[PDB]
């Protein structure tokens, strides 16, 4: 039997799907970061990076609805193992941080081509996608800014990782 | 500051983190097969396929979870492209049952060695995924025999894909 | 057209296949025990044994159900007649007692052999089954008990059976 | 202790007790057609099967209950091992349907022996188990003239199954 | 009268009535260590370890009904006094992970032994003790590592102890 | 860092440990006493026994809280052994009944302490202690004139032990 050709160009098709295995890494990165934080005392940290991991392969699987609706081939990728030895929180965060921004570039430079090839279905269907990105992007930012402001002196590191405990339990 | 040791034996967290890896495989494996059906008009096996992909990353997430509670490093490992290439929706699913069959000797495998090693709190919490798993693997022998049941010829296919749409949309 | 193979080893298969013959029979031997005692003016325990009767019915459909999803061959045995003269109420809930230590180290053979060819799936679904057996078990030990403690001095079988109706119309609500 | 006799004639209590044994020899015979038709795909008329097996066992209890009530002795004899070889579908319920006729011969019977004996107890007792026992001889009859009406060429047995399994489900 | 004799065999019998004694020296136990953070004004301790006192004799109690139920005598034997001289609340915590780690590895040791004895109802019976056990492992080691987290510089005794008392009363 | 001063006087802390103390001894008498009743048939006697010996725990704590809330260091002995050889009911709720006596007077005693070193905070605390000890040493002297009205003559440990067990049921609610 026949079915339709995909519905998006290569282009569009390969950036989605390079997003899709990008969305997917996130998850394991950030897994392995809660890791960090979960067995060395950091339960706080532990629990919001955990919850964020779980959010990042949500925007997977959008992603994976949005091609599968094109009758476009999801293209899983091999991707290396994340990274597991990290300095302290601070560390942490700000390579989270570093890691939202180039997220945030990596949509932008979807939306662009779809603008540019005249794709205004995937333009339409991305602004979800751009709205929730730019709302991690400005929380990682005012995280790694509280962390950074409580320091690590006396007390500093528990201070700093029940401020994030809060922020994992308001977050839902 | 000193943080306490990992909770569970050197075997045991081996065997559940490697466990927490072969469910992130499963995920991309069902992903992959999923979207060959929804390429080739099967939406009802696309979606009970995505549905069954999702699922199995909850159960990585539970078992990462455990991992943290005990203090046990999660150590996820690279990933590796999932069969992309199918023959049919016969050959998907046969392959799947196999699958299935595979994770709950892995499961077994991780019980009796709870067992073997007095491990209890390991053997209590695993009881939820034992019975989990038996329930999927039931599944996927019921829905292969009745796609075997059903067979090819003039609309065969069709009537086993609204059959799995029918699964699907029954265990949301 | 090809269906999948039974989903268990063929030594678990056997076990639970008898499993199900052997509450089949507790079935037919506890309906026996309340006739015998519905036919000798004993009501409490007619209807006590019979209800218990029921549910190891209900025990045998579980089996089955279990059975059948694992693709796996149910095969139903003869049931031999059951006994049906008895002495008193003291010798049938002596037998009965007798009767569910045997039930219950039936049942802990099976969850053995789960254990030792690693089927998992079978030990957790044994596990209602372990429960309401020791339940049971525990429940005739009492009630054994309870009848060899009034005896059958001025009224004491009246006290028994009363006291056995008692327990009957608590269990089902 | 004296306790009175049965209440009922010697005739009665030889139809009533054989009863209960070919109700219980019943429930047997339809729980293994309801195995082979689980252990050949065919799910919809197992599910349909083993609920009537059960229904056949809650005749036996009501006529065990009636027999209790009349101070009458339940004379459970051995119960044979019920058929196991079926050849398929339609050959099951042509089975089913002719045992289901038989069984109502054997109510009429009984029925019949109550008129001629004036015990109109019984008589009255049973009226529940002719109407029942009328409604399930039907019911295999219209299940029989489906299976054959549908046949077992291209997708009959599947279709033939899904309508069992409809059945099986209104009924509960 | 003759009472039926106890349905446990004598191993498990002793096993049982030393966990029975156990708990009971536990219960005394965490009220001195709470009594002591009472005196040295850490009520959020004082209060955790006194609820926690509480829960030991409860377990003690459902261990004892267990026995009654199965004709098994409970064997009480002399509940020594409990250690009453402690150096801190990081000492205390520490020597209370310690003695929950080994009221963990004595449950193992119990359920271990009635697998070897096929003993299954009381394998059964002890999955609500060592799911519950666990937790309270777990939850030790948590306050245990927050505490160090924390340490005894400027307010951290004080910080640890309001900690504690955040978890005594999410308990409740 | 510096904690306020044990907030009651010497005399009374001692008494009030020993009282913690007498509780808990008491909690495992009882339990002790409760495990004989169920392993000798006697159900009812045997749960009203075992859910007072957790009444005597639950008083240990009330005493443990006034203790902490006044800075006194609770200071918990060893528990002997309690007795656990026992002739019949009758024996045991004798027992117990004396027993109830000795806990009753050992309130009476600190309460007394209480008012001549006129510690009212300790006097006032006390009177809930008072009230439901008074409520239990004539729960006792009740089951024990039953006991004893009833006899162990034909079917007499039955009647009492149900008897029993409707009391212990009725105060659960
Ligand atoms: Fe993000
Ligand atoms: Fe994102
Ligand atoms: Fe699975
Ligand atoms: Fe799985
Ligand atoms: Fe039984
Ligand atoms: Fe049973
Ligand atoms: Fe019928
Ligand atoms: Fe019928
Ligand atoms: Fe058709
Ligand atoms: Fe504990
Ligand atoms: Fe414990
Ligand atoms: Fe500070
Ligand atoms: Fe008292
Ligand atoms: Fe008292």
Chains 1, 2, 4, 5 share one sequence.
């Not at 160009?9 to 392995?32: C, F, P």
């Not at 809660?34 to 532990?46: I, K, N, Q």
């Not at 990076?49 to 992603?63: G, R, T």
């Not at 794709?119 to 991690?136: C, K, P």
Request: glycine residues 4%; charged residues 25%; contains cysteine.
């Amino acid at each position: 039997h026949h079915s339709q050709d995909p519905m998006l160009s290569k282009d569009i098709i390969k950036l989605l799907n390079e997003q899709v295995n990008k969305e997917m890494n996130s998850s394991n990165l950030y897994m392995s970061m809660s890791s960090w934080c979960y067995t060395h005392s950091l339960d706080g940290a532990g629990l919001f990076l955990f919850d964020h991991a779980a959010e990042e392969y949500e925007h997977a699987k959008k992603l994976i609805i949005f091609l599968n609706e094109n009758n476009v081939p999801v293209q899983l990728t091999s991707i290396s193992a994340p990274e597991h030895k990290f300095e302290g929180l601070t560390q942490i965060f700000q390579k989270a941080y570093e890691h939202e921004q180039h997220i945030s570039e990596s949509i932008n430079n979807i939306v662009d081509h779809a603008i540019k090839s005249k794709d205004h279905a995937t333009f339409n269907f991305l602004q979800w996608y751009v709205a929730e990105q730019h709302e991690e992007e400005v929380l990682f930012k005012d995280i790694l800014d509280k962390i950074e402001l409580i320091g690590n002196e006396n007390h500093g590191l528990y201070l700093a990782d029940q401020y994030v405990k809060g922020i994992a339990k308001s977050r839902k």
